[PDB]
Structure formats: C-alpha cells, structure tokens
Design an enzyme around this catalytic site. Structure first.
Site, mmCIF file in Angstrom:
data_model
loop_
_atom_site.group_PDB
_atom_site.id
_atom_site.type_symbol
_atom_site.label_atom_id
_atom_site.label_comp_id
_atom_site.label_asym_id
_atom_site.label_seq_id
_atom_site.Cartn_x
_atom_site.Cartn_y
_atom_site.Cartn_z
ATOM 1 N N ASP A 187 6.319 7.703 -8.303
ATOM 2 C CA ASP A 187 5.372 8.806 -8.386
ATOM 3 C C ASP A 187 5.758 9.886 -7.385
ATOM 4 O O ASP A 187 6.125 9.583 -6.252
ATOM 5 C CB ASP A 187 3.956 8.310 -8.092
ATOM 6 C CG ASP A 187 3.554 7.141 -8.970
ATOM 7 O OD1 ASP A 187 3.948 7.124 -10.155
ATOM 8 O OD2 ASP A 187 2.848 6.237 -8.475
ATOM 9 N N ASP A 539 -0.219 3.252 -7.476
ATOM 10 C CA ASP A 539 -1.301 3.389 -6.507
ATOM 11 C C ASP A 539 -2.643 2.999 -7.118
ATOM 12 O O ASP A 539 -3.470 2.363 -6.463
ATOM 13 C CB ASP A 539 -1.359 4.819 -5.959
ATOM 14 C CG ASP A 539 -1.481 5.863 -7.055
ATOM 15 O OD1 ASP A 539 -0.864 5.683 -8.125
ATOM 16 O OD2 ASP A 539 -2.195 6.867 -6.845
ATOM 17 N N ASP A 543 -1.770 1.494 -12.857
ATOM 18 C CA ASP A 543 -0.394 1.094 -12.605
ATOM 19 C C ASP A 543 -0.300 -0.419 -12.457
ATOM 20 O O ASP A 543 0.788 -0.989 -12.522
ATOM 21 C CB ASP A 543 0.120 1.767 -11.332
ATOM 22 C CG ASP A 543 -0.303 3.220 -11.231
ATOM 23 O OD1 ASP A 543 -0.307 3.915 -12.269
ATOM 24 O OD2 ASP A 543 -0.639 3.665 -10.114
#
Ligand SMILES: CCCCCCCC/C=C\CCCCCCCC(=O)OC[C@H](COP(=O)(O)OCC[N+](C)(C)C)OC(=O)CCCCCCC/C=C\CCCCCCCC
Ligand SMILES: [Ca+2]
Ligand SMILES: [Ca+2]
Ligand SMILES: [K+]
Length: 830
Positions: A187, A539, A543
């Site tokens: 990310d 996070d 995910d």
C-alpha cells in the site's frame, strides 16, 4: 522427529559406538599375542573414547548456543507439515547416509588382500578388523554432523537482526520464504510514504465569465503539522484575510474534520490528533487565519486550537454524516448556534474526493456569490485538479463544497450509509486543497534494490490512476517516459477486463488505484497462477483474508492487531524499506547454510579421496583410524560451526530470487564441491609421498619403489640401501595429517562467501571463524609437541622446514576456489 537427525546425527553416533566396539575387540585379541601385554594395548580404546567425549562437548555447546538464540528471541497438527527446504535437506541426508555407507564398505572391500599382511601379525581376521576400524572412522569423519544446530542459530541470528531493523516475524518458517520473494505488493499511503501530509497548495474561484473562468490559486508554506507558515499568492506574502474566497474554504476545513492538535510540551513540536488527512486542514486553518485573530500572543499549547476554536462558536455541528466508500465524501450539518447567525439560515458543509463533489454539484460560489455550474467552470478547474496531482509534488486534491439549502433534519436515515449520498445532490462549490505526503527517503532506492534483485513491486493506493502513476514515476517504479498504460489499472478497469485477461494484467502490473477490498485476495490468486511468491501488505480487515492467501502476509505497527496476528511478519516501522531489508536477511541466512554445507562436503570429500587414492595408487596408508577421528573433531567441529556467523554476502541482492523448485545443490556447485574435494584429497597423499621421495632426511625413493613397497623384503636388489620399516614411519603420516587439517582450515576461509573473493571479503570478516581456526591449529600443535601425545596418535614433531611444505601444499586450495569463484562471478552470474 527429523529425518536428517535420524539418518545422520544418530547414525554418526552408532558408528562411533561400533568403532569403539571394534577397538575393544582388538584389545581382547591383543592378549593372545606375545609381548602385547604392553601398556599401549589400552591406548586406542582410550582415545576413541576420549575423542567421543570432546565430540560430545562440542555437541552440548552447539546445542546450548542454539537453544539460547531461540529463547533470547522468545524472551525479548497431526504431524504432517514440512518446508520444501526441510524436505530437500531430509532427501539430502538420506543420500549422504547411503552414499557414505556404500563408500565405506568399498573402503573395507578394496583392502581384502591387505588383511593377511604381516603388519597385522599375519592373521586375516586381525587385519579384517583393522580396515573395519578404518572404514567406520572415515564414515564418522565423512559425515557432515551439526547441520540442524547451525541452521537453528542462523535462523534466529538473522531474526534478532531483523527485529533490529523493525522487521517483526510472526513465524520462523516464514523468513525462509521472505528470501524467495518474487513480488512485493504494498500500500502506498503510510508505507511507501509517511503519513505527514499537509496542505501546501489551494485554489478557489476568482472571476467568472462564460468560457472565461478565472482561478485564484494559493501556495501555503510549512508542510509540518504546525501553524508555522504563511499563505502566498504568486510568490508574494499576502495575509489570507485579503481574499473573500478563503473564508468559505477555511470554514469547511475546521467543521468537517474531527481532528485536534494537542501540542505536546515534552515533544517541543506540534503533534497530531485524529486522522492524518483531516489534521492537515486543521493546520491549514491556523496558517491562514482569515478571521485575523490575535495569533502571536497565544501560547504554543493553544495556538494550534486557537483559530480552530474561533469557529467552534461561530456555528455549531448538529450531526455529522459518516463516510461511505461508494460516495467518497462526508458532510456535517451546522445550524448557527450561540452566534446569532441563525437569522441567516443554516448550511451543510461537505468534504471529499473532487469528482464526486463536482458531478454532484450545481452551483459555484464566487467569494460571496452564486453562479450555476456551467461547462467552462467545470472543465477549466478540473484541469488544475489534474495538473496538480500529476506534477512534481503529486498533490492529493480535495474538493470543498457547501449546501446552502439542506434537507430538513426531520428527515434523515442513519442505519443506511448508502442513503447519505442522496442528501448531497444540490450544493455550491468553494475550492480545492492540494495536499501531499512525501515518499520515505530512498524508497526509490529501495525500489531499485528490488529491481536489481529481480523482485517486482506493485503499488496499491486509493488515489486516482493519474496521480497513482505520477507517484510510481517519482519513486522509480515506472519510467519517466515509459508507456505505463499497460502496467497500471483501477478497480473499474480491472473489473472490466475479461477474466483470463485479468491474470495477464497481473504479470505486468506495478500499480493499482481505487481498489475494491476483494481485489487484493484476487490479485494474489493471479500472482500465484504465475507461480510467484507474493509478499502482500495490509492494514484493514479488508486485507485480512488476503494476508492468509499470500505467501508473506505483512502487517503494520500502527495497524489493528487483527491483521498483526493473522500475518507472517509485522512492520513496526510501517516502512516499505523494512520489507526489503527483511527480504535481504532471508537470503543471507540461506547463503550461510550453503557456505556451511559447501565447506563440510568439499572438505570431507577429500578425506574420502585421501583413503581411496593411497589404496588405488599403492602408496603406504596415510591415516590410521584414531587420526581420522582427530581430523573430524578438528575440522567437522568448531570451525564449521563458526561458519554460521558469516556476514551478509555482497552479491546478495543482485542474483534473482531463489525458486523453491531449485535443487539443494546445483550442478556447478556439485562440480565445485568435487574439484576442491579432489585437490585436498590428493594434496594430502602427495604430502606423505613428498616425505618419501623429495624430503631432506626423508629416504628419497623412486615413485616405483614407493608404489611396490610390499616387496621391499623380497626385492633386495630393487630396494638396495633402504630399510623396510621406513614405510611404517610416522613422519609421512604426520605430513598427510597436518596438511589435511591445515588445508581444511584454509578451505574454511573459502566459505566466508559463496562467490566473493577473499580480496573483497577478507578472512577477518568473521572473527569467530579465526578464533575457531586458531583453536583447532593450536590443538593440533599440542598433539605434535606435548611429548605423551605424538606417541599416542603415531605422529612425530614437524620442524620448520616441513611445516612450510604443509603451507606450500595447503594454500593453493584457496587458490583453486578463487579460480572457481572467478568463473562463477564472471561466466555464470549476470
Ligand atoms: C606457495 C603456494 C601458493 C599459495 C597460493 C595462495 C592463494 C592466494 C589467494 C588470493 C590472492 C589474490 C591476489 C591477486 C590480485 C588480484 C586482485 C583481486 O581482487 O582479484 C580480483 C580478480 C577477479 O575479480 P573480479 O571478478 O572483480 O574481476 C573480474 C572482472 N573483470 C573481468 C572485468 C576484470 O582476481 C581474482 O580474484 C582471481 C584470484 C586467483 C589467484 C590465484 C590463482 C593462482 C593459480 C593456481 C593456484 C592454485 C592451483 C590449484 C589447482 C588449480 C586448477 C585450475
Ligand atoms: Ca563428521
Ligand atoms: Ca572435515
Ligand atoms: K499468508
């Protein structure tokens, strides 16, 4: 249980035991002989046993250093699971066990004719036992014991080192796969870039005529979360209270955000409360101050919330509409309370992604005016939206708007967030705040390291594709002029591709913008289709199911503990560089294993070549059983163990990621094992043969005599002027032994790296190995010079002259590998 332990570590122990048994049988049989009641009879069993004690002490200290490393890390299942590597090491150990077994039986078989030799007393059995003691003692020596304890140390050695670099591993078998990493999906926000984003630029509506829309851009200074800075217009310092447009924008910033600025006195610098995004607006309000409140006199502890508190009573928030992923914006309802401003009605402030707040916009405010949002007012301000987030800075634009005629509070749903969007259809428009977070230092360089390492990076951000690509270009993921319209997709784009076309996209992609939660698990699915080891970061709980499907689920230090538990490794740094620094360590450990294995295999090959060579040539035997045990104790011991303390290799992040399909030993490496093995095994018998043929006060014989030495008693005319008992001399056996031990201590220096020359990585790059070499060397000198000792091992003291011959013979083993390590670097690697 372990298959390697069962077939190597335990098998080696039984060999020692049956060796001692063979000794004590010779002990009993040496009673029925005449004159063999001498006090030498007990010596051989007393040595095999005494060596077994020291070989055990080594074992204890090798196990004590392993259990400590695991514990020091830990301090601060129907039996059917094993790593592909663990399956390969167990396949290896089974082969080594079987090969050595056949090899040693062959040793005993090629000496059938030597059984009834006069040296054994003329008895067939007495000789048949002796060469049994030879073959077994060789088997003990040839066996590469100590592997699991050396790995266990390295496995935990790097782990302590990874924790030092903020890399916190969940499981231990994970770090093996970290080195085999092919693709790192990460990310952008928070990881590839710090979460210290502030508003540096902002623009609003200035002058409006049909197809003549003018903009009033501003550039604020001080990109830290602090009121330090002044708003600038055309590089000219002007107070924010000079333009009426900044009034409307500042109002929305402090009312839509739920972020505070608690100046921590112990820190000395202004801190952040709430979310990083919304916090920037709060700092923006103070740096602007359109109200022109008294700024300087207000203390550091309150200034940050000072100008923010001026608006806390100017109006008052009734209720706040939550954020929704579909709408991509949020709103507050504020009826002017305690300010007598309720007479001028009430408004509704919104804050979110440009396109959503622009497509769903019908009016554009000009300072304190209202104009219907027409064509030019739209496309000629969204051109600035584009050129801001695509430039050098790559801003994150955030459109700010207001609803002058809000729906009644008597009609509002809350359990359905999808209805919230329908309450924001008609609204005015104020402006847009350009906001940027900076990529961490040398991410661009850490990206580079992956590229050299053959590791692919894939960015997963929430920005638009335009700025997402601009980000990749900044950090070298994409070229500055590379056509990336094939390597960058969005949530809408990736879903609009054919199912089979989608996986093809994952073979080339390096960027993903505006991505649905389901895509992360869907990308790993496609990356695994191309057989790629994927390291995925996360996070949120979106995910979570992806951090279980990926090979290396990577969590965050600031991330929720749900993902931190359901991952394989956690970044306490929240840094992308920590990911690759932990990948590097994964490679470093595996290399350290290969150095350990190379040293043992290559050296121990020569020890086998040694016995087989003298037998095949016809030379007097170079080694007796108790000497073979000394070779093992000294070379297979502490020096080999200290090899697990090798520093990280230099050519570590330049070679492609190691596939789990690759065999434990490559073809070239096997040849490299044999070559060095071939030399040390020949150099050791050439050492003994040198004492005979060419040594001073070593009875110079022709090669032919030395080969046919068994006929010395018979061939008087061919062996004229020579004494037959000289073929039993200890000096040549000492030369062979001393060389073998020296040439293996030299070969240890060859294993400080796989391909890097000793010039590049010096012998003192591993102090623990030097001490190990010093110890073994001094231990060998003890046997040679402490008077009761040489008699025991059938050795004699070496003078300076013949100790130099040991050097002249040994040292080329470093020379040979350097020749091979040259070919590896220059003809195989690249
Ligand atoms: C009295 C008994 C003798 C004792 C022998 C002890 C050995 C000493 C150990 C090391 C000494 C090295 C000093 C040499 C100075 C060179 C400096 C160095 O830094 O070196 C780097 C280069 C290669 O490095 P590069 O990849 O960066 O350049 C390649 C890149 N490009 C192609 C663009 C140039 O030099 C290399 O490392 C090549 C190093 C090879 C040197 C030894 C070879 C001598 C020949 C035989 C000895 C052993 C024979 C045994 C059986 C042989 C059968 C074939
Ligand atoms: Ca051994
Ligand atoms: Ca050895
Ligand atoms: K996983």
């Amino acid at each position: 249980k372990s298959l390697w332990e069962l077939v190597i570590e335990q098998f080696e122990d039984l060999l020692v035991r049956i060796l001692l048994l063979a000794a004590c049988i010779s002990f009993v049989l040496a009673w029925f002989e005449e004159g063999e009641e001498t006090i030498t009879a007990f010596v051989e069993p007393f040595v095999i046993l005494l060596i077994l004690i020291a070989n055990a002490i080594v074992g204890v200290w090798q196990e004590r250093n392993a259990e400590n490393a695991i514990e020091a890390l830990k301090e601060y299942a129907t039996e059917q699971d094993k790593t592909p590597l663990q399956q390969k090491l167990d396949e290896f150990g089974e082969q080594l066990s079987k090969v050595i077994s056949l090899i040693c039986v062959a040793v005993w078989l090629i000496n059938i004719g030597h059984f009834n030799d006069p040296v054994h007393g003329g008895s067939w059995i007495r000789g048949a036992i002796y060469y049994f003691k030879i073959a077994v003692a060789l088997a003990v020596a040839a066996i590469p014991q100590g592997l699991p304890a050396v790995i266990t140390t390295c496995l935990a050695l790097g782990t302590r080192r990874m924790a030092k670099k903020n890399a916190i591993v969940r499981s231990l078998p994970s770090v093996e796969t970290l080195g085999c990493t092919s693709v790192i999906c990460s990310d952008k926000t928070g990881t590839l870039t710090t979460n210290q984003m502030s508003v540096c630029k902002m623009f609003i509506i200035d002058k409006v005529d049909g197809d003549f829309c003018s903009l009033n851009e501003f550039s604020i200074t001080g990109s830290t979360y602090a009121p330090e800075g002044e708003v600038l217009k055309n590089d000219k310092p002007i107070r924010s209270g000079q333009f009426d447009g900044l009034v409307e924008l500042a109002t929305i910033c402090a009312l839509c955000n739920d972020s505070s600025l608690d100046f921590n006195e112990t820190k000395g610098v202004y801190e952040k409360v709430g979310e990083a995004t919304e916090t920037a607006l709060t700092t923006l309000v103070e740096k602007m101050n359109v109200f022109n409140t008294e700024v300087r006199n207000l203390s550091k502890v309150e200034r940050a919330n000072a100008c923010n508190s001026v608006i806390r009573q100017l109006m008052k928030k009734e209720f706040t509409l939550e954020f929704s992923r579909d709408r991509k914006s949020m709103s507050v309802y504020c009826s002017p309370a305690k300010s007598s401003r309720a007479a001028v009605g009430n408004k509704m402030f919104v804050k979110g992604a440009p396109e959503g707040v622009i497509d769903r916009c019908n009016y554009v405010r000009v300072g304190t005016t209202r104009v219907p949002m027409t064509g030019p007012v739209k496309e000629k301000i969204l051109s600035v939206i584009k050129e801001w987030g695509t430039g050098r800075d790559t801003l994150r634009c955030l459109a700010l708007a207001t609803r002058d005629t809000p729906p009644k509070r008597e009609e509002m749903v809350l359990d359905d967030s999808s209805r919230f969007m329908e309450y924001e259809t008609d609204l005015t428009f104020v402006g847009v705040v350009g906001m940027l977070d900076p990529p961490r230092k040398e991410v661009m360089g850490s990206i580079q390291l992956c590229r050299d390492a053959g590791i692919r990076v894939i960015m997963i951000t929430g920005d638009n594709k335009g700025t997402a690509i601009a980000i990749c270009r900044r950090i070298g993921i994409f070229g500055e002029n590379e056509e990336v319209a094939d390597r960058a997709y969005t949530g809408r784009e990736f879903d609009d591709l054919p199912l089979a076309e989608q996986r093809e996209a994952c073979r080339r992609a390096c960027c993903f913008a505006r991505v649905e939660p389901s895509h992360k698990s869907k990308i790993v699915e496609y990356l695994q289709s191309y057989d790629e080891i994927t390291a995925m970061t996360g996070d949120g709980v979106n995910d979570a199911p992806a951090l279980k499907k990926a090979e290396i689920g990577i969590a965050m230090g600031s991330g929720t503990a749900v993902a931190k538990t359901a991952s394989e490794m956690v970044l306490a740094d929240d840094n992308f560089s920590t990911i690759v620094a932990a990948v590097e360590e994964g490679r470093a450990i595996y290399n350290n294993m290969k150095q350990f294995i190379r040293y043992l295999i290559s050296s121990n090959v020569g020890e086998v070549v040694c016995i087989f060579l003298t037998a095949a040539l016809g030379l007097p035997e170079a080694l007796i059983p108790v000497q073979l045990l000394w070779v093992n104790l000294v070379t297979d011991g502490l020096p080999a163990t200290a090899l697990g303390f090798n520093p990280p290799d230099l050519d570590i992040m330049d070679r492609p990621p190691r596939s789990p399909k690759e065999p434990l030993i490559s073809g070239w490496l096997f040849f490299r094992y044999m070559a060095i093995g071939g030399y040390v095994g020949a150099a050791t018998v050439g050492a003994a043969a040198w004492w005979f043929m060419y040594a001073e006060d070593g009875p110079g014989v022709t090669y032919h005599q030395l080969t046919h030495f068994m006929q010395c008693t018979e061939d008087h005319p061919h062996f004229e002027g020579l004494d037959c008992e000289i073929f039993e001399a200890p000096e040549p056996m000492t030369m062979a032994l001393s060389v073998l031990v020296t040439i293996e201590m030299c070969n240890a220096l060859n294993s400080l790296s796989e391909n890097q020359s000793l010039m590049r990585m010096p012998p003192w790059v591993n102090i623990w190995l030097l001490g190990s070499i010093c110890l073994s060397m001094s231990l060998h000198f003890l046997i040679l010079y402490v008077d009761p000792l040489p008699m025991i091992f059938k050795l004699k003291a070496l003078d300076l002259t013949q100790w130099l011959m040991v050097l002249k013979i040994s040292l080329p083993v470093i020379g040979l590998d350097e020749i091979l390590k040259f070919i590896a670097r220059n003809y195989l690697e690249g």
